[PDB]
Design an enzyme around this catalytic site. Sequence first.
Site, PDB file in Angstrom:
ATOM      1  N   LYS B  53      55.230 -22.316  71.794  1.00 55.22           N
ATOM      2  CA  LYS B  53      56.264 -21.290  71.963  1.00 55.22           C
ATOM      3  C   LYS B  53      56.243 -20.666  73.363  1.00 55.22           C
ATOM      4  CE  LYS B  53      57.819 -19.940  67.350  1.00 55.22           C
ATOM      5  NZ  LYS B  53      57.038 -20.793  66.457  1.00 55.22           N
ATOM      6  N   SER B  81      54.364 -10.520  65.609  1.00 52.29           N
ATOM      7  CA  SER B  81      52.945 -10.538  65.925  1.00 52.29           C
ATOM      8  C   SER B  81      52.394 -11.940  65.691  1.00 52.29           C
ATOM      9  CB  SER B  81      52.171  -9.481  65.134  1.00 52.29           C
ATOM     10  OG  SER B  81      52.302  -9.722  63.729  1.00 52.29           O
ATOM     11  N   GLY B 182      61.672 -25.138  61.621  1.00 54.12           N
ATOM     12  CA  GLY B 182      61.981 -23.876  60.981  1.00 54.12           C
ATOM     13  C   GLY B 182      63.374 -23.434  61.436  1.00 54.12           C
ATOM     14  N   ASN B 244      73.195 -21.799  66.290  1.00 52.30           N
ATOM     15  CA  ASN B 244      73.101 -22.410  67.617  1.00 52.30           C
ATOM     16  C   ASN B 244      72.357 -23.747  67.515  1.00 52.30           C
ATOM     17  OD1 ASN B 244      74.414 -20.102  68.523  1.00 52.30           O
ATOM     18  ND2 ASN B 244      72.677 -19.333  69.713  1.00 52.30           N
TER      19      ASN B 244
HETATM   20  C1  LIG Z   1      57.598 -21.668  65.689  1.00 49.76           C
HETATM   21  C2  LIG Z   1      56.825 -22.812  65.172  1.00 49.76           C
HETATM   22  C3  LIG Z   1      57.402 -23.980  64.647  1.00 49.76           C
HETATM   23  C4  LIG Z   1      58.870 -24.131  64.371  1.00 49.76           C
HETATM   24  O1  LIG Z   1      59.697 -23.955  65.543  1.00 49.76           O
HETATM   25  P1  LIG Z   1      61.266 -23.598  65.259  1.00 49.76           P
HETATM   26  O2  LIG Z   1      61.867 -23.686  66.639  1.00 49.76           O
HETATM   27  O3  LIG Z   1      61.288 -22.230  64.692  1.00 49.76           O
HETATM   28  O4  LIG Z   1      61.777 -24.691  64.322  1.00 49.76           O
HETATM   29  C5  LIG Z   1      56.572 -25.017  64.316  1.00 49.76           C
HETATM   30  N1  LIG Z   1      55.222 -24.956  64.426  1.00 49.76           N
HETATM   31  C6  LIG Z   1      54.651 -23.862  64.932  1.00 49.76           C
HETATM   32  C7  LIG Z   1      53.155 -23.834  65.073  1.00 49.76           C
HETATM   33  C8  LIG Z   1      55.427 -22.774  65.295  1.00 49.76           C
HETATM   34  O5  LIG Z   1      54.809 -21.714  65.815  1.00 49.76           O
HETATM   35 CA   LIG Z   2      63.428 -25.559  56.468  1.00 47.63          CA
HETATM   36 CA   LIG Z   3      77.838 -21.541  70.240  1.00 47.34          CA
END
Ligand SMILES: *Cc1c(COP(=O)(O)O)cnc(C)c1O
Ligand SMILES: [Ca+2]
Ligand SMILES: [Ca+2]
EC number: 5.1.1.18
Lengths: 323, 322
Positions: B53, B81, B182, B244
């Site tokens: 991230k 958090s 996600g 999006n």
């Molecule tokens: C945030 C996250 C995801 C999923 O990413 P999205 O862009 O929300 O689909 C997958 N694995 C980890 C460890 C994450 O922190």
């Molecule tokens: Ca899902």
């Molecule tokens: Ca758009």
Amino acid sequence: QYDISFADVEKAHINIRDSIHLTPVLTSSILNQLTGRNLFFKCELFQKTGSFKIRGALNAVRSLVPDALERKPKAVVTHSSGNHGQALTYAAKLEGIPAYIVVPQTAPDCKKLAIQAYGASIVYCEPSDESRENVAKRVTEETEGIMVHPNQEPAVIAGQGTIALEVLNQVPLVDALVVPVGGGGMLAGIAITVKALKPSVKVYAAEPSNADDCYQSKLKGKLMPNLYPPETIADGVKSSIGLNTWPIIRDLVDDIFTVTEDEIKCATQLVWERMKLLIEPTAGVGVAAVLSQHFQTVSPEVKNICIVLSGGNVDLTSSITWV
Amino acid sequence: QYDISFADVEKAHINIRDSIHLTPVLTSSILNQLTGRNLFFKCELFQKTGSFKIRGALNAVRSLVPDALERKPKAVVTHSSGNHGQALTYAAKLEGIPAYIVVPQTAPDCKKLAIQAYGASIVYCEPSDESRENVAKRVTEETEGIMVHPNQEPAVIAGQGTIALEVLNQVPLVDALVVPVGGGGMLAGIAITVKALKPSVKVYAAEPSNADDCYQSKLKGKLMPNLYPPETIADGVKSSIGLNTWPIIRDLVDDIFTVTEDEIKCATQLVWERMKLLIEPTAGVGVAAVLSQHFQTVSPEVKNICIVLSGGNVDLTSSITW
Ligand SMILES: *Cc1c(COP(=O)(O)O)cnc(C)c1O
Ligand SMILES: [Ca+2]
Ligand SMILES: [Ca+2]
Ligand SMILES: OCc1ccc(-n2cnc3ccccc32)cc1
Ligand SMILES: *Cc1c(COP(=O)(O)O)cnc(C)c1O
Ligand SMILES: [Ca+2]
Ligand SMILES: [Mg+2]
């Protein structure tokens, strides 16, 4: 001169290369930020069998003879049930020969189950050395096998030294290697290798203070094994150094750093949490050494330090306990 | 055309590369054996902050502007958090600006201490969605700061795409990427990048069957969010895909594999024990996908498969719990 030469280490690398992993060297800004130094982590926890000991075990299987009259080992035998026995079994399996681990009647059921689950056969002995010795020799002789000591067998020492061939190739600007020490097969193999190729690079040993025979031997200038079985969370370094590894360590290892149980535990947890590497606590010893107060005496010129993360064979249950 | 294009991923790469890790790709003989495939594991658990991230977070901090005269944010404000908040906090540290986290006054001491450990500054709100939003809005405005959506912000989706730019260099003959989904910022970013650079490479999503809005959306041809907040050990993929990321996912993602809770748990433990990598359960989602029965039927031509191990931020206590 010593029980192995650099030529033996190279014969070992040639013998084992097609069956082991050339493990990566990883880095951590956090550990780099913490220790003052520029750290490199040689990841033997990713090695086949979960520890570096496949290097020595496979070299021994592919280099030792059972007898003057037979060139090929027909079995392997050891009294070591942990990382060494696991590695030796895998080596035996690669070569299509049976492995026997000599185990006391008194070993924990979990130890007996784990041996059988790595593919070895168990031969029972009494908890005595007279028994253990009678039994292993009987097995070695009757199976036409090789007995493969976990740390004093020269072919084993030579194989563990191949770690250092990789590290020097992988980290050309390395200034020092930090190696956890038990019986000193890995320490000695690496010290031979480094001092043959680039003796300006330091070799440092890391050892639990609770099992400090390598420190006491280097202090005294002679081999001083632990008088009693040590208690330490670093279960893979409970052996004392021995007659074949001690002369190498005396002459070719630059310094020993000892670390407390709490230091080992904190360094282990730090690697788990901040590097996401599941090292066994024994492999946390070298990390604790570099974090320790006494490692501050290492010259600032010694900047690029490769720590051997020697193994990852940890049980989560044994963990839950000490975390 | 979508909320991002590949041009945005290339920009994000230039923006962030000096500050993130070009994480290694590792392999596993045992997992190759269990799948029948040549697996490559993109190790985002080793990324700064413990998850991928930081890529989207840093790109956002370095490209979004506050509602103020000065074009550079003077703070970052978050409700998270978790992996997102941690990533944003680090991005803020790199830029020498405070990170504030809005926290209900009734948070446990444990959580508060944990938040302060990674260096976020707590501002309290009352424990309702109204107060949470209003405090964050106030803080963001008064501090001349920015807020960054965890998966629908274009700058975030573009930064996450940089994963795939690296994977295509590190595994030139890759045939497929497997990505946990996600909110789908990572999946969408990756899909844009893959389909722009080497579109014969498959992009597969993996999600818990307990949170199967991505699967359902792709089946129906329309965005079908989780009707209720999901229960899964895969904490990081509880968000539904949004407005999006959905069109990207609809058009550019080849297939979605769902996995049960037990598959997630088993795949996580397998990676811990056989690979010695402390992945979080959410990152076990993609591994579980490749081990799953449905995946076994994927054409054998799809041989070289890169799984994103997306995070390693796992709590020891919670692991003991399962
Ligand atoms: C945030 C996250 C995801 C999923 O990413 P999205 O862009 O929300 O689909 C997958 N694995 C980890 C460890 C994450 O922190
Ligand atoms: Ca899902
Ligand atoms: Ca758009
Ligand atoms: O901090 C998270 C965390 C989780 C699990 C562990 N862990 C310890 N011993 C283990 C053996 C097998 C698998 C995982 C193990 C360490 C750390
Ligand atoms: C065996 C072992 C060591 C010690 O090597 P010696 O040659 O006995 O000094 C260190 N770390 C691990 C994980 C081991 O299994
Ligand atoms: Ca010792
Ligand atoms: Mg001798």
